[PDB]
């Protein structure tokens, strides 16, 4: 009971980070595709928000 | 220079509702080539799924 | 046609450097291995010698010879291609020419646009509704 | 002829010498190309920029 | 995210809205293809020039 | 002159073909008897790989090059 | 427990049965998929198909 207790907090800080890693990328193409349409980088980014 | 700029492309409402949906698949097939790790990668940078 | 014509002259000089008969340092290794052959394992000292070369000749054509297939044909062949692509498009005349297309599916091709316009429409409706 | 004995004397020295760049500057390539050769397992085109 | 992207269209009113005008690299876009047809119409008649 | 271009052509096309990577069934040789030196007797395996593919390109530049360079300045060039 | 003890079974049982699927499996993908996809080695994407 000790051990698996032991690996409850820095699991959870490495879910933290690969959350990190995977909205900034999915941004990245938010940014090439619909960099030239300001209403819908606007839309598609709080998208990314909500759906992440 | 033609490339890299954009817009309109069609300014009537039928042909609009089509390039929208055409530049949505563009989109969407960079997420699904991005999920396998398959996207064109800049200079000096890393995949993301090497990261996570 | 050109590059199969290429391909053609390029068979004979590979065959016709072949015959000038020449031999690499490497010639050790061959002569190494048919004595095994021979002895710890006449026409037996010039047709074994000549098995030996033989062996090392198998290697070299068993690369050249798909080296230049795919090398001519599969490669050269497509770039070329794909170069030469760029000279039709020079011509200014041929654009409204290249481009005729059937009776049939030009008619199609509006339906099918003004069709898909009015069903997506009718469900923007239905979705309406139940709010 | 004696300058194809020499020759066979360079093949050697060139593989010895790429031989020392691969595993010092694979690294790059790997951590680079590694989805779009499909998490390898052996890289194809890695190997084939060595080539 | 995929499936998210397709509800977007569910407005119909909104494809105008969606893709407003930029408008200033969005005319250049025009001035850029002025320029090439010209450019492509040039090269045609130093090929015609070259017998 | 027209002889030192045909040779000066020719080793450069030479090249070319190199760069195309093939070696169906002969390969199979090398890299059976990599396994007896190396583990017997991964960054790692791309090395061995890399190297086993150079022995044999070994063997053919060790005679390639040799034969473009006498075809065309000795056989062909004295009938010339 | 007793059929947690079963279920151990099937899954070791599973990779005797499976043997019958990869060798037409690797029929397809000798004339296909492995000189297809850029002369394999084990190819990745072939691997996730029988996994």
Same mark, same amino acid.
């Given at each position: 009971? @000790? ?20 909205? @900034?990328?999915?941004?990245? &193409? ?23 | ?52 | ?28 290794? &061959? &002569? ?15 047709? !074994? ?18 080296? !230049? ?63 | ?49 060595? &080539?």
């Amino acid at each position: 009971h @000790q051990y698996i207790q032991q690996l409850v907090e820095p699991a959870l800080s490495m879910l933290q980070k690969a959350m990190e890693i995977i909205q @900034q990328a999915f941004i990245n &193409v938010a940014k090439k595709h619909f960099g030239e349409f300001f209403n819908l980088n606007q839309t598609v980014q709080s998208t990314i928000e909500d759906i992440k | 220079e033609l490339r890299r700029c954009g817009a309109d492309i069609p300014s009537q409402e039928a042909d609009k509702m089509f390039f929208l949906i055409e530049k949505i698949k563009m989109f969407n097939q960079d997420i699904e080539k991005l999920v396998e790790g398959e996207e064109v990668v800049r200079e000096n940078e890393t995949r993301l799924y090497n990261k996570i | 046609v050109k590059h199969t014509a290429k391909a053609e002259n390029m068979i004979q000089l590979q065959f016709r450097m072949e015959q000038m008969v020449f031999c690499q340092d490497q010639i050790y290794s &061959v &002569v190494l291995k048919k004595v095994r052959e021979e002895i710890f394992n006449s026409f037996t000292e010039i047709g !074994i010698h000549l098995n030996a070369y033989f062996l090392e000749t198998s290697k070299r054509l068993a690369n050249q010879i798909p080296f !230049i297939i795919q090398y001519f044909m599969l490669r050269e062949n497509g770039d070329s291609l794909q170069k030469a692509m760029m000279q039709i498009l020079q011509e200014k005349n041929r654009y409204s020419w290249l481009l005729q297309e059937q009776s049939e599916t030009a008619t199609k091709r509006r339906i099918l646009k003004e069709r898909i316009y009015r069903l997506t429409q009718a469900r923007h409706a239905l979705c309406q509704f139940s709010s | 002829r004696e300058d194809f004995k020499n020759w066979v004397g360079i093949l050697a020295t060139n593989t010895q010498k790429v031989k020392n760049i691969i595993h010092e500057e694979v690294e790059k390539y790997e951590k680079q190309y590694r989805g779009k050769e499909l998490l390898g397992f052996v890289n194809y085109k890695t190997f084939e920029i060595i &080539v």
